[PDB]
Scaffold this active site. Sequence first.
Site, PDB file in Angstrom:
ATOM      1  CE1 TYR A  47       9.125 -50.593  20.958  1.00 16.87           C
ATOM      2  CE2 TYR A  47       7.011 -51.453  19.931  1.00 16.87           C
ATOM      3  CZ  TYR A  47       8.132 -51.605  20.782  1.00 16.87           C
ATOM      4  OH  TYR A  47       8.196 -52.740  21.559  1.00 16.87           O
ATOM      5  CG  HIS A  85       9.085 -48.401  16.017  1.00 13.89           C
ATOM      6  ND1 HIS A  85       7.971 -48.395  16.832  1.00 13.89           N
ATOM      7  CD2 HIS A  85       8.656 -48.738  14.762  1.00 13.89           C
ATOM      8  CE1 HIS A  85       6.890 -48.805  16.117  1.00 13.89           C
ATOM      9  NE2 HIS A  85       7.295 -48.996  14.833  1.00 13.89           N
ATOM     10  CG  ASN A 138      11.765 -58.460  26.173  1.00 14.84           C
ATOM     11  OD1 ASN A 138      12.163 -57.265  26.038  1.00 14.84           O
ATOM     12  ND2 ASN A 138      10.524 -58.772  26.472  1.00 14.84           N
ATOM     13  CG  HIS A 168      11.598 -52.078  28.043  1.00 20.05           C
ATOM     14  ND1 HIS A 168      12.437 -53.159  28.160  1.00 20.05           N
ATOM     15  CD2 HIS A 168      10.401 -52.566  27.679  1.00 20.05           C
ATOM     16  CE1 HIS A 168      11.765 -54.277  27.757  1.00 20.05           C
ATOM     17  NE2 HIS A 168      10.545 -53.920  27.470  1.00 20.05           N
TER      18      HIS A 168
HETATM   19  C1  HEM Z   1       7.638 -59.397  22.010  1.00 25.55           C
HETATM   20  C2  HEM Z   1       7.108 -58.467  22.752  1.00 25.55           C
HETATM   21  C3  HEM Z   1       7.831 -57.194  23.041  1.00 25.55           C
HETATM   22  C4  HEM Z   1       9.236 -57.018  23.190  1.00 25.55           C
HETATM   23  C5  HEM Z   1      10.299 -57.986  23.053  1.00 25.55           C
HETATM   24  C6  HEM Z   1       9.289 -55.566  23.462  1.00 25.55           C
HETATM   25  C7  HEM Z   1      10.614 -55.023  23.707  1.00 25.55           C
HETATM   26  C8  HEM Z   1      10.798 -53.694  24.128  1.00 25.55           C
HETATM   27  C9  HEM Z   1      12.102 -53.156  24.455  1.00 25.55           C
HETATM   28  C10 HEM Z   1      13.385 -53.914  24.547  1.00 25.55           C
HETATM   29  C11 HEM Z   1      11.885 -51.735  24.646  1.00 25.55           C
HETATM   30  C12 HEM Z   1      12.904 -50.730  25.132  1.00 25.55           C
HETATM   31  C13 HEM Z   1      13.640 -50.144  23.852  1.00 25.55           C
HETATM   32  C14 HEM Z   1      14.670 -49.201  24.445  1.00 25.55           C
HETATM   33  O1  HEM Z   1      15.685 -49.645  25.061  1.00 25.55           O
HETATM   34  O2  HEM Z   1      14.508 -47.987  24.346  1.00 25.55           O
HETATM   35  C15 HEM Z   1      10.453 -51.516  24.476  1.00 25.55           C
HETATM   36  C16 HEM Z   1       9.842 -50.240  24.573  1.00 25.55           C
HETATM   37  C17 HEM Z   1       8.446 -49.940  24.246  1.00 25.55           C
HETATM   38  N1  HEM Z   1       7.577 -50.936  23.911  1.00 25.55           N
HETATM   39 FE1  HEM Z   1       7.895 -52.884  23.476  1.00 25.55          FE
HETATM   40  N2  HEM Z   1       8.163 -54.901  23.528  1.00 25.55           N
HETATM   41  C18 HEM Z   1       7.213 -55.896  23.211  1.00 25.55           C
HETATM   42  C19 HEM Z   1       5.808 -55.652  23.144  1.00 25.55           C
HETATM   43  C20 HEM Z   1       5.213 -54.389  23.091  1.00 25.55           C
HETATM   44  C21 HEM Z   1       3.795 -54.171  22.805  1.00 25.55           C
HETATM   45  C22 HEM Z   1       2.787 -55.267  22.469  1.00 25.55           C
HETATM   46  C23 HEM Z   1       3.679 -52.797  22.771  1.00 25.55           C
HETATM   47  C24 HEM Z   1       2.544 -51.880  22.536  1.00 25.55           C
HETATM   48  C25 HEM Z   1       1.583 -52.311  21.742  1.00 25.55           C
HETATM   49  C26 HEM Z   1       4.971 -52.215  23.108  1.00 25.55           C
HETATM   50  C27 HEM Z   1       5.163 -50.814  23.298  1.00 25.55           C
HETATM   51  C28 HEM Z   1       6.425 -50.260  23.806  1.00 25.55           C
HETATM   52  C29 HEM Z   1       6.557 -48.831  24.003  1.00 25.55           C
HETATM   53  C30 HEM Z   1       5.483 -47.805  24.141  1.00 25.55           C
HETATM   54  C31 HEM Z   1       7.918 -48.616  24.364  1.00 25.55           C
HETATM   55  C32 HEM Z   1       8.559 -47.334  24.814  1.00 25.55           C
HETATM   56  C33 HEM Z   1       9.317 -47.018  23.455  1.00 25.55           C
HETATM   57  C34 HEM Z   1       9.941 -45.675  23.545  1.00 25.55           C
HETATM   58  O3  HEM Z   1       9.526 -44.722  24.309  1.00 25.55           O
HETATM   59  O4  HEM Z   1      10.904 -45.354  22.805  1.00 25.55           O
HETATM   60  N3  HEM Z   1       5.930 -53.156  23.388  1.00 25.55           N
HETATM   61  N4  HEM Z   1       9.793 -52.690  24.081  1.00 25.55           N
END
Ligand code: HEM
Lengths: 726, 726, 308, 83
Positions: A388, A365, A174, A101
């Site tokens: 997060y 987060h 999402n 993202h």
């Molecule tokens: C339902 C499943 C998931 C959805 C809907 C989701 C949604 C998102 C969204 C919308 C963001 C961007 C937030 C922003 O605009 O800054 C994001 C970032 C992130 N997501 Fe998720 N994600 C999901 C699953 C996961 C999983 C399973 C993991 C790790 C175990 C994960 C790790 C991350 C990380 C590392 C970031 C970067 C966050 C940051 O640097 O601030 N995501 N996710």
Amino acid sequence: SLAPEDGSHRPAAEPTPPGAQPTAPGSLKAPDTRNEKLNSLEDVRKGSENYALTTNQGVRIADDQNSLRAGSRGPTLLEDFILREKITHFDHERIPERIVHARGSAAHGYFQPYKSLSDITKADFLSDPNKITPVFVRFSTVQGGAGSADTVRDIRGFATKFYTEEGIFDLVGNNTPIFFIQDAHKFPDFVHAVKPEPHWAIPQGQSAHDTFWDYVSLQPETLHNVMWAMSDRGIPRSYRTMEGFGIHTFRLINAEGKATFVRFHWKPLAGKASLVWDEAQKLTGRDPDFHRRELWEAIEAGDFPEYELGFQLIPEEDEFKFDFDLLDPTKLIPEELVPVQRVGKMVLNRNPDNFFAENEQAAFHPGHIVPGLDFTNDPLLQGRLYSYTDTQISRLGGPNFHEIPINRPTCPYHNFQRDGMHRMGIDTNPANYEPNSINDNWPRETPPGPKRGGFESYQERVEGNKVRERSPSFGEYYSHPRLFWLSQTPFEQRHIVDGFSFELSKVVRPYIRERVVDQLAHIDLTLAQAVAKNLGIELTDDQLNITPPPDVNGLKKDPSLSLYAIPDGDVKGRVVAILLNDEVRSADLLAILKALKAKGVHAKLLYSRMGEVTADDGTVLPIAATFAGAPSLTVDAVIVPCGNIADIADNGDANYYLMEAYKHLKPIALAGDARKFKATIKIADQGEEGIVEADSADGSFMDELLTLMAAHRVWSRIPKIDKIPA
Amino acid sequence: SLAPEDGSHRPAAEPTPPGAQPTAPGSLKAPDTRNEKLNSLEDVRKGSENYALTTNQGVRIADDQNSLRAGSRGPTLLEDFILREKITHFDHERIPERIVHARGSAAHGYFQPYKSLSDITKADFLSDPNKITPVFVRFSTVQGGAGSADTVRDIRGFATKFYTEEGIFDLVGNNTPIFFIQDAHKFPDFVHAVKPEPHWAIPQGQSAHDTFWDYVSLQPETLHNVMWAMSDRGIPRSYRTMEGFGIHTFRLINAEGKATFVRFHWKPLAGKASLVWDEAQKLTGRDPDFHRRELWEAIEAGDFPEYELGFQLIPEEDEFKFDFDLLDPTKLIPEELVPVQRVGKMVLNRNPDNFFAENEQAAFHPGHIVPGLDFTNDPLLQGRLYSYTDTQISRLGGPNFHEIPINRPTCPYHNFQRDGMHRMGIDTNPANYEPNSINDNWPRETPPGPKRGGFESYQERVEGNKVRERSPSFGEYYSHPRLFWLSQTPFEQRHIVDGFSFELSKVVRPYIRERVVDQLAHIDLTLAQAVAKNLGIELTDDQLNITPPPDVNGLKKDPSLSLYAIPDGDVKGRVVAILLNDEVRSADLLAILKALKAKGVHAKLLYSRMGEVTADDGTVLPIAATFAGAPSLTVDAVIVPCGNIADIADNGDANYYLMEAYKHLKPIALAGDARKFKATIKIADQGEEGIVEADSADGSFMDELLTLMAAHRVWSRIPKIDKIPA
Amino acid sequence: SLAPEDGSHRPAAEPTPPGAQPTAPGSLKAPDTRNEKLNSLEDVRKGSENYALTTNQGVRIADDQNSLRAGSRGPTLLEDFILREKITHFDHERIPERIVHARGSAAHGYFQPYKSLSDITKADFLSDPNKITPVFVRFSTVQGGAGSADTVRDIRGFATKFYTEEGIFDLVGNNTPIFFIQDAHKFPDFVHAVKPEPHWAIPQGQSAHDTFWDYVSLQPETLHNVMWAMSDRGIPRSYRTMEGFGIHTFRLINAEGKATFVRFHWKPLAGKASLVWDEAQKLTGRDPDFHRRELWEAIEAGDFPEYE
Amino acid sequence: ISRLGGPNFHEIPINRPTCPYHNFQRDGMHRMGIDTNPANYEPNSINDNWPRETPPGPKRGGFESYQERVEGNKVRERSPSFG
Ligand code: HEM
Ligand code: HEM
Ligand code: HEM
């Protein structure tokens, strides 16, 4: 080096249509738009007019054009502290982008509920219809870097930070209602497979490559969100025109302690709309910032993004009542089985001032919940709770990222945590531990209760052995993709076939294409066969005999899964191109502009050069862009008034503008002698549904165009477009 | 409520003497003390009383004693976001220490000039005797880590940040008037040699090891500052009783463009005073925080540290008038040749609230100058200009370390720098570059002028080839060490010899000791022979015939170089130990305390256990510490009143207390049968100078004692102390 | 040439008693002491004798004594890439210290079992008496910074890294058999109470201050390890003469899948020995590196620390 | 330094020289090379001053800047020849 004498360098601080003024920082464009979070950022907003240029230590600079040197042709000297601080700051501007993202666009806004939800949740932000909660929202793509294009085919993120009186709640969702994988342990494998391949770091912003389809073909739990991504859901027209979903089942906890399962939805009040592939893909080249620009310019125009928060609610005793597991994030809950209850409205009404400080540094987060909410054992949600906070640490430089202004709560926060890089808050508490007597144990723990209480987890019973094992109830992969498929209109099905066909044609290893087609034959044989025909693959007899998967609790279709099956079109905020000539018939232009204004539809006036043209009555018309410079890709419909049509009748760019608009299913309206352009789009004289034509523009001509625009695209033209060379 | 019912957990918010109350954060101890910088920090001060305990996102915590588990003897769960945030912050509390001067103690205060200096400098902070400038000052050692001891033998840092109306000026000095090396290229070499050796990381806080003296023996430019370090200047009694120096020659620039050479001085208004080596060394063990504690407790008592800023001024046309190069930072300017002119007074009158946020995160850098000052080509100063910005990058996490609250200017600062980790300021300027027309070129450059002008460098002439070469004028190493040595009292000379003797006895490779003795013999033969005798080394006939170096511009001494040659004793703020017995004579104690009180001297009442004792007349006497708990090392003098002396006459600790004090040259006063203690320090019956004795503790018993205290230590006792087993 | 003619600048590469020779890096003092981990580090060891002095980019330096200036009394020039690299590296030498146990002293060694423990565990490092596993062990105090003194009154850490054929196993223990607190949620509160107080950052290396005893007085679960700390266990004579414990109950799992509970101990074969308080406190002033020096010198003498 | 994490970016494999490199620089984040030199400063006698400076010469010599003449006053000024 100054501003023009006429003040034309500075945008008016009032709402204006896209292109009418240069865009500006939100606090300058809309200084009277306020909310508690935007006001709280005033401590750190820095002006500029009338101030001296200085170093970061406050020393005024006399010459910011030259380094200090021994003679004007001599070597630069070490003692130039002004040069050194400016170059040092510049050399350290960049911070790591988000792992996923990374490409996203954000705005400020506010939310309020329609009625108190106290019977199902004690969350303070849902307790009172007249209690407003500021929000900050970031929309994103998933795979590409922060400099990648907006209108790629991808899932989109929709993250909302609610600044509540009882803490920040981040709803990190999402634009489709399921995810690709079931357990967080696989997230790095899935993300690595969709991201650019590791030897050469190609391709950007695209799942159309071997490693993604290798993974999909070997992990059929991915097939449901793949179907969504291959449909026109993967190419939204705007962040204003897509749905949002929290995906996971969460819990609501009321003051009596009763838990209800909930899934979160956002409904776009502008309606659902998507591009078509060829349009989306060319727009990544002509305007890679199209969605970021459109969002910013809708907020400047007063076309504020509005979304309705909705909850699907399931009582605790109905946990096991469906044919799929509620805790499985690859499964959706059909709205035919569990309706979405409307809960509140969110309005995004101000752009940020500085993209880096507010968008790039925002941290969302899903572990940030508040009393009145709780988690469930969804094994994907469970693993997100680890990631997060840890990531926001290397990305944002240390454990004090909550003190970065955009991330700060607007409610009180006090605890015994101390130090860490870039610590802003200066604690005066004599104690940095509890229990303490030396500060009479303040700040103190707070018992849970109906309002303003401390957080307590719902006391869910846990019974099982310590295992690394997938629940057997999660091992069903084809019924939800099939339900989705069957709920799409025939044109949406065609676009899904084309999306799989286009992507698998870019997979270099043919066996991977064959294995994806075999998975498709487990979903629907019509889909499988249509993709296999485009890939020159013949299904085997065994593949033709695979039994279709069961219906989902008796459903054969659910129309809320389609973008278009149920009309929901809203033309306010859409944009039409008006192709000018050097002697426009001003009566046509009058009628056109009046009808568009009444419906809140914007216009862009285009010509073969920039500057001005003069209409038949002397009206001087400023030209927004050339036909090449603002292609049909960037508008919703095209209108060509009469006048001196010979000026443009033979212009290749003008003719191509209509051909691209026609191929992309856009409404086209031609008045007067502009009807001679019917010949370039090689069709009828009796007319055709989708092309509005008349001797002049007027009430009836504009009504007919506006009705077409309310239906978004002219789907009936699809069979006529494979012959058009555009 | 955990606080005691009587409120004795909370220190009095008024000035109190050392040990009377627990210490506290400065804004809670002295809420009425203010200055412009302290007031500007208010926006980031966080309280605690009456607030709920929360996460960093503002969620109230109900249970801060337990992790979330599956059953109360079960495994901890990943969904515990409250535990995770709390452990994550803690995991990341530490930031890198400073590369040098990592151990330091800081305070807030203010500066005011005595008169406008506009005739010699346009520096705004010096322009008006009514203009008061807030300061933040950090004193430090050099070699040891942040957790090393205060009273080591080392050079001390004395760094002052002036928050002026025309920018931050940092005066980053030490407590000696020269440095060890001439060119910044050698700083990593010197510092590596002094710092703990790289195989095993020993020794901490000490230059008494092979690598330091190897470098010294090979780099005779180091010998001047080594002489200072081996003298009692290397072991100050307090940060309040040491001098400070900018070391380098800088320039003052007035409104007419005239440059004057300047060297900066701080004169301690409490006078100059140092420990003796055995005391200093033992104190590193008994109280490794003794200087930090003393500075904090002086401010809490109202014994504010006060220093007079002074300038040595040399006209431009006198650059070459001396036997040494003004640009050589291993040479001092004797005050017999160029007197120090008084410029203003600095008073340190408030301690920080939080040591990490204000002391650890403060960043001082000598390149932070303001209009009215300028640099010279001193080659050590030149190289410093590179170092302090870069290092503050890895140390403090990014290029926005000026936004950390203690580092922020109090005057306006505006520029086109953007982004970087932990960016707090949110810029609303439409432009981030200049020249620009879109914001009419703001913020704008400012021409230099008499006041409020932009900075312009003095147009010094540069002529020569690009070379890596030391100036020949720097190649003289022995004459300033000899001037220093000659300016010392005999007892100070004896301490220098003993400092070299002790240090070189810890050098394991004997040839290094021999090489250092050879360098000493180029400075003064008496010094070199005295050190050689202590090392069993015999000087050769060639060493015995080395010609002494010449005098410095005809000087064969300058008493301003001695700590003690010209008495400057102030007793206010010093501390006396009073050794109690189980039946103290109250008339003695009354007399003692009254006289100490009138002169601002503190007392600590000691005994063999804690609690209280009762005087002969029934007065209850609160004990501060035990004999072993607050050793003589921590006080300036010792008084023993009369009473039941047989209670303590055979207490080993009470005897040792007096022998330790005696050995360390401290005044000791004995009243009545306390004269029985003469036998434990071997004093004759006619008595001796430095032991005050009488039937009771008045008429002139207290006047005699306070007279010895004004003279700091009893130097004439030195021949007697070698016999005493202590 | 700056070394003395007689070669007395270089210590002999043979065991010598404390003080007989200057101390030296391990691979120069004992070049033929080897184990699998010490041999694997050979790729990153760098020498120095007979090599030219260079930048990090491999450029040979001619003058490492002076900055580049415009005239020998002129201003220093920004084009001095040699000075710049050398100062830039120096400006970034420090990294954050450990949040706790910042003060520690470490050595290489090896471990060998007395018998196959296959009936109780399938751990490969315990499977055969002739299987030698390299170790690296760090001993530490808990509260003080990395530049604080060694013979303070404190708990000590005893952390061993076993480089096994089936993975690194870290046994991260202390010198007393229990800890101060029951649940990790309280660790930051306990550590903050024992650490120097937040307003003025005093005292270093000591629990003898109000906030530590405040917390103890309010949290009686602490009292057992407080008893240990106030005993002479809190002031060991040497890292060689103290015990080690993993504290927690862990499990051993054998090839049949049977679990046995286990607590881990280290018994010093040099026996147990502590200082007395006045001696320990005074030693923090006379030699704050006393334990680090004693461990190093014991190994240089062949008085290897041994533990069962 | 900020992009690659500290002052040892020359030890990241792709950036490493293929020729010898030896000096007295130590520590920094991510330090890979384990220095065995008893000395981390020069001049030193405890390692016979190695590694040692090398005079300039026609091949395999130390770097020396060309001795260009500098003449002028300390100014922030664009040369007129550039206008
Ligand atoms: C339902 C499943 C998931 C959805 C809907 C989701 C949604 C998102 C969204 C919308 C963001 C961007 C937030 C922003 O605009 O800054 C994001 C970032 C992130 N997501 Fe998720 N994600 C999901 C699953 C996961 C999983 C399973 C993991 C790790 C175990 C994960 C790790 C991350 C990380 C590392 C970031 C970067 C966050 C940051 O640097 O601030 N995501 N996710
Ligand atoms: C006259 C010679 C010098 C004096 C008087 C001087 C004085 C000081 C003082 C007092 C500090 C501590 C400031 C504080 O309390 O935070 C300091 C820190 C420092 N000095 Fe200097 N120093 C001198 C030479 C040098 C040279 C030649 C270099 C490098 C080329 C240098 C590099 C540093 C560095 C890297 C720091 C740590 C700065 C920080 O982390 O904020 N020093 N110096
Ligand atoms: C029986 C209880 C514990 C024992 C025996 C223990 C032992 C140790 C030892 C010996 C070290 C130093 C390792 C080294 O030499 O580098 C260490 C470091 C550390 N410990 Fe523990 N500890 C315990 C509890 C905790 C808890 C409850 C936490 C956090 C919840 C914790 C967090 C840390 C951290 C953050 C470090 C620094 C690690 C590093 O930077 O590499 N400790 N501990």
